[PDB]
Ligand binder design. Structure first.
Ligand SMILES: CC(=O)N[C@@H]1[C@@H](O)[C@H](O[C@@H]2O[C@H](CO)[C@@H](O[C@@H]3O[C@H](CO)[C@@H](O[C@@H]4O[C@H](CO)[C@@H](O[C@@H]5O[C@H](CO)[C@@H](O[C@@H]6O[C@H](CO)[C@@H](O)[C@H](O)[C@H]6NC(C)=O)[C@H](O)[C@H]5NC(C)=O)[C@H](O)[C@H]4NC(C)=O)[C@H](O)[C@H]3NC(C)=O)[C@H](O)[C@H]2NC(C)=O)[C@@H](CO)O[C@H]1O
Length: 154
């Protein structure tokens, strides 16, 4: 289980917004922690909502929780990290493990957020360079939200 410092807490929020779960527009009972992709919400946190949301006629997603974690990885990480519930706690746990895996923790820790975002581009589609054909936020606007999550850059 990864230690949460503020750079990481911010990379998370930045992701929550990039991902649009904690972006102010999206309705939510917690902070995107109950947000399912597509916008609907879940109220039971003992586990991932595992709700397959049909976004458009040609595309679907399991992405849920703050960092729009595909359930695939949720299972991977909750088992890897012995996460009991899908509490926001467990949701962060995962986000950070992936982040750590992208070897972007030293980057997040040290503010090389473009480098982290680009390093984490394969983790979240809303990030630039991700290449998931999803709406990719300009790197500049992610850095921006990140900064407003409390994160520090450069
Ligand atoms: C349809 C559609 O459009 N869907 C989109 C959806 O896909 C998007 O969601 C994102 O998807 C991508 C792609 O599926 C996901 O990306 C994957 O993310 C996982 C992270 O959870 C990655 O898995 C990890 O990969 C790393 C490799 O970089 C693994 O780490 C390595 O583990 C090995 C152990 O096996 C370590 O090796 C050992 O190392 C030691 C020293 O440490 C050495 O001494 C030993 O000898 C050595 N042992 C061996 C056997 O070699 C190694 O150190 C370590 N490396 C690092 C840096 O950690 C890690 O184990 C993997 N964990 C799991 C779990 O598999 C996966 O690689 C990555 N794939 C790609 C292609 O990037 C992404 O997670 C997902 N995000 C979300 C939120 O779900 C979304 C995004 O918005 O859009 C949809 O549209």
């Amino acid at each position: 289980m990864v230690e949460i410092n503020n750079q990481r807490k911010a990379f998370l929020d930045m992701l929550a917004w990039s991902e649009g779960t904690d972006n102010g527009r999206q309705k939510t009972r917690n902070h995107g922690y109950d947000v399912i992709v597509g916008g609907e919400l879940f109220t039971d946190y003992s586990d991932h909502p595992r709700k397959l949301v049909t976004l458009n006629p040609k595309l679907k997603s399991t992405g849920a929780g703050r960092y729009q974690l595909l359930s695939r990885w949720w299972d991977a990480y909750r088992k890897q990290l012995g996460l009991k519930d899908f509490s926001p706690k467990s949701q962060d746990a995962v986000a950070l493990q992936q982040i750590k895996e992208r070897g972007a923790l030293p980057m997040i820790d040290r503010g090389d957020i473009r480098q982290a975002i680009d390093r984490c581009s394969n983790i979240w589609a809303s990030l630039p360079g991700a290449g998931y054909g999803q709406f990719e936020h300009k790197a500049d606007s992610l850095i921006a939200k990140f900064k407003e999550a409390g994160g520090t850059v450069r």
